[PDB]
Amino acid sequence: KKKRLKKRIFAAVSEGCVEELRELLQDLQDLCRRRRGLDVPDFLMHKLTASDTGKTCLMKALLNINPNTKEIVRILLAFAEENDILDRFINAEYTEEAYEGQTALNIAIERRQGDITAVLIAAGADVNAHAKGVFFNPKYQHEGFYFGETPLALAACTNQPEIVQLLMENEQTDITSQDSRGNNILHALVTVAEDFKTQNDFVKRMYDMILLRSGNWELETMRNNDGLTPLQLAAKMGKAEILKYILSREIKEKPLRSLSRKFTDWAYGPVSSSLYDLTNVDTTTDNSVLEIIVYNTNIDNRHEMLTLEPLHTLLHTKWKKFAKYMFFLSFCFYFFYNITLTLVSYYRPREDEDLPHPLALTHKMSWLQLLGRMFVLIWATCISVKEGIAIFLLRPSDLQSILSDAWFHFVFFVQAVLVILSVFLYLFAYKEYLACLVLAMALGWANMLYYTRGFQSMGMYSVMIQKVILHDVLKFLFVYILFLLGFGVALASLIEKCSKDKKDCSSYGSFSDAVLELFKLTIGLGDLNIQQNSTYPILFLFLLITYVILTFVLLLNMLIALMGETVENVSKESERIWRLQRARTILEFEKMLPEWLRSRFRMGELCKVADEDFRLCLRINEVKWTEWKTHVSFLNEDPGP
Amino acid sequence: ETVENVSKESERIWRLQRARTILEFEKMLPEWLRSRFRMGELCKVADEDFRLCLRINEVKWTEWKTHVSFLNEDPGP
Ligand SMILES: NCCOB(c1ccccc1)c1ccccc1
Ligand SMILES: NCCOB(c1ccccc1)c1ccccc1
C-alpha cells in the first residue's frame, strides 16, 4: 500500500515530537486533497488506525508518554476537529480479539493522566465504554486485571479518586451499568479489593465514595450473571475488609442515611445501642451471607469474617437460643445409640442362648430388652437417610475440603449403613455377620469426636487430634516403619541365620517374628525370651538399644515437629478451625429445623427514615466508651417498654 | 527458640538440601533435549531482535507510577 505516511506518524507520535508532526499534518492535508470521494472518514481511519490490532493514533499517543503529550493530544484532537471525524476518532476501539473495547479513554485513565482525561471527556469520549478482551482470564494471576471493563470502574479500581470525581459528575455516565459478567461497579471493587490491611486502603474509601456520590439503594440489589449481590460477592470471594464496611456502613448525614446498614437505637453518653439493617445477612432468604460464608470452602479467612459484629452475635444467638439444645439432644440420642450396640452384642447377662444374634427380634422379649434393639434400627436408618441426601448435595465440597470438614457426614453414614448391612447380612447369613457389625460399633464410639465440638476447649483439643492424625502421623509413621524395617533386617540375621541355641521349634515366620519382637518394644511389651542365643546376645542387645534410642529421637523430634509457633499457631489455628467447624453445624441445624415455628430471633422492625413503619429486620447491640461525640442519630431514649 | 530457630533453620537447611539435588539432576540430564525453560528472547534496546534469554513474572499493587517501560500490551499470542 506504500504506507510511508502511516508508520512515519506513529513513530513521531511515539516520540511525542510536535514540530515533526506538524509537517506530517500538512502533507496529509494535501493527501486528503488528492482524492475526495470518501473525503475525511474512510481515508484518515485507514491512516490513523492500524490494520490488524485496530490501535489508533490517539491510543498510540497514550501508550507512550513524554511531557509533550499534553500538547500532542490537543493536536491530534484538533486534527480530528478540523476534519470533523472526532466522534469515531475519540471512541475507536481495538478490533483485536485480546482488547475488545480498550478505548482511548480507558488507556488515558490507565496512565493516570487526570488533566488529559478531562480534555477527552470535553472532546466527547465515550465514558460508558466496555473492554471485553481476553484480559478477563480465569487463569487470573497472569495477564489478567479484571476491573469490570468500564472507564468509571477503572479509575475506581486504580486509586484515581479525582477521575471518579470527574466521571461521576458527567451526567452521561451510566453508574448503574453492568458487565459481560453482569457486574456493576460495586462488584468490580469487590473483585479487586485485597485482604491486605490498610494499603492506604483506597477501595473501602472509594466503595464509600461511589454510594455517597450517587445512587439509591437500587445498586446493591443488582445481581451479576451468577446472581450475587455485592454483599454476597464480597462473601463468596472472601474479601473480608470490604465486608467489614458493608455490614457496618454508618452514615452520619440526613439526605442519605437510608443507605446505611448500621443504625443507632439510642445514644446516652458512653453507652449506646446499635442496630443492623441485616436484610440479606441472616439465613432467611435463598443463598444468604452466612450461607455463603460458612458453607464456602474456597476462601482462606472464614474466621476473619465471622468475627464481624453482624455475623458474630447472630451466630451466638442462633447458638444460645437454638443450636445448643439441639446439639445436646442429638448428643444424648447418638450416645445412647452407641451404648445400645455395646449393651446388645457384648453384654451376655448370664449364659447367652448358644451364640445368639444381636439385632434379632425373637418371639418373646420384654419391652425393655428389645426396644433398644428397635432404637438402634430406627436411629441408624434416621442417620442413613440424612446424609444420603448429602450425597445429592455435596458434590464439590468433599474433594476441595480434602482434610478440613464434611468428613463427619461420611463417617456417620458409613457407621449407619454397616449397622443396616449387618441386618441385610442376617437375611443371607454369610460369614461376615459379626465382622460388619463391629466396625460399625468401632466407628460408633469413634464418631463421638463429632460431639467433642461444643465446649470451647474440648474441640480445640479434638482439632489437634484431627490435625496430627491427618497431617503428621503419616509423617512419623513413614520414618518409624523405616527404622523398623531397617533394623528388622539387621535383627533377622540373629534369627534363622545366627546361633539361636534352641530355636526353630516355636511357631513360624523368621523375618516376621524378628520384626514383631522388635515392634513390641514401642508398646513397652518387651520380651526377653525371644533373645536366648550364643554370645551374640552381647551384639543383640546393643543393636536393640540402638533401636530404642533411634526410636526415641524419632519420638523426641516428633514433639519438636509439632513445635514451631506452638505458642501461637498450633493453638490459635486449632481454635479458629474449631469455630468454623462449629458454625457449620449450627447452620446445618437450621436446615434440620422445620419451616413452621421459626418464631425466634431477628428483632423488631423499627423505622429507617421512610414512610413505612416496619422497614427492615434488625439486631441490637451495646457499644461503649471514649471518643465521645454529640450524637444526632435517632429516638433519644432508652429502648422502651 | 524452638518457636523460631529449631523449626526455621531445619526448614532452610532442607531447602538448600533439596536445591542441591535439583542441580545435581541437571548434571544427570543428558545434553540433548534440554528443550525446557529459559523463556523467549525478546529485545532489550538494540538492533538485534533476540538479545538475551528471559524469565517472566507477575508483580503487583500499590505505589503506582505512570509507567514508561516497554511494549504496552498484554503478553501476546
Ligand atoms: N460471643 C460470641 C459467641 O459465639 B461464637 C461461637 C462460639 C462457639 C461456637 C460457635 C460460635 C462466635 C461467633 C462468631 C465469631 C466468634 C465467636
Ligand atoms: N434425621 C437425622 C437426625 O439426626 B441427627 C444428626 C445429623 C447429622 C449428624 C449427627 C446427628 C440429630 C440431630 C439432632 C439431634 C438428634 C439427632
Swiss-Prot record, chain A:
Gene: Trpv3
Keyword Glycosyltransferase included in the entry's annotation: no
Catalytic activity: Ca(2+)(in) = Ca(2+)(out); Mg(2+)(in) = Mg(2+)(out); Na(+)(in) = Na(+)(out); K(+)(in) = K(+)(out)
Activity-regulation annotation: Activated by cannabinoid that binds to the vanilloid binding pocket. Diphenylboronic anhydride induces pore dilation and enhances cation permeability by promoting the conversion to a homopentamer.
Residues of the full protein shown: 115 to 755 of 791
Family, as annotated: Belongs to the transient receptor (TC 1.A.4) family. TrpV subfamily. TRPV3 sub-subfamily.
Protein name: Transient receptor potential cation channel subfamily V member 3
Quaternary structure and partners: Homotetramer. May convert from a homotetramer to a homopentamer to allow pore dilation. Interacts with TRPV1; may form a heteromeric channel with TRPV1. Interacts with SNX11; this interaction promotes TRPV3 trafficking from the cell membrane to lysosome for degradation.
Cited function: Non-selective calcium permeant cation channel. It is activated by innocuous (warm) temperatures and shows an increased response at noxious temperatures greater than 39 degrees Celsius. Activation exhibits an outward rectification. The channel pore can dilate to provide permeability to larger cations. May associate with TRPV1 and may modulate its activity. Is a negative regulator of hair growth and cycling: TRPV3-coupled signaling suppresses keratinocyte proliferation in hair follicles and induces apoptosis and premature hair follicle regression (catagen).
Disulphides: none
Provenance organism: Mus musculus (Mouse)
ANK repeats: from-to residues: 3-34, 56-84, 100-129, 147-177, 184-216, 226-248, 284-306
